[PDB]
Design a protein around this ligand. Structure first.
Ligand SMILES: CCOP(=O)(COc1ccc(C[C@H](NC(=O)O[C@H]2CO[C@H]3OCC[C@H]32)[C@H](O)CN(CC(C)C)S(=O)(=O)c2ccc([C@@H](C)O)cc2)cc1)OCC
Lengths: 99, 99
């Protein structure tokens, strides 16, 4: 599909057996999701942007479905104010910017 | 152009007569640039990111050329970690997401 940018590019994702709304974010290197108790091992990480850094848990090889397009990669979980689909997964679903 | 996301979507912009590098950022509502000198009036504003809120200077109706496409809109100037082009200007240059 084609997503205009008049409004936030929010889409439905499926992760860890749950459906959620997330932002398709070309400004994010990697993917950051709201607090959720995923199974498996993880390692602590710090990610920063406007306003400073937050503490997150890094999970590797997590399967996410984004608008019916499957992707598998690293997912950071923590007190992010919004679910952010970053380039690590956007590339896997063939997402591009066009103007 | 069509821009893939294997690398950060960095482009050259022209603002206030100076060239800079900025990130096309579909997860940003607004455009925020690092500390710089711009002519004209401005008003204090607050903007919140993944880490919290920062103080910025709001410049309205600013001419900015993004990858050869002209825009005139609001530019926020403050301690952002990177120059980001937000949806307020991405819409002006006709940018969409496609997958
Ligand atoms: C309930 C809402 O809470 P808030 O309002 C903020 O919500 C948010 C917070 C963040 C975002 C996404 C970010 N956008 C953003 O900063 O946009 C600003 C400017 O325009 C405004 O629009 C939205 C906010 C304003 C951006 O796309 C991506 N970033 C990197 C850029 C900065 C280089 S990143 O997130 O920092 C990030 C850092 C490291 C990594 C690792 C993993 O690679 C992955 C992502 C969108 C909405 O207040 C909270 C106190």
């Amino acid at each position: 599909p084609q997503i205009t940018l008049w409004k936030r590019p929010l889409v439905t994702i499926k992760i860890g057996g749950q459906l959620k709304e997330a932002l398709l974010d070309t400004g994010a290197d990697d993917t950051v999701l709201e607090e959720m108790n995923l199974p498996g091992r993880w390692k602590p990480k710090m990610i920063g942007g406007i306003g400073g850094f937050i503490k997150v848990r890094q999970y590797d090889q997590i399967l996410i479905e984004i608008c019916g397009h499957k992707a598998i990669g690293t997912v950071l979980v923590g007190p992010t104010p919004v679910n952010i689909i970053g380039r690590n997964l956007l590339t896997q679903i063939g997402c591009t910017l066009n103007f």
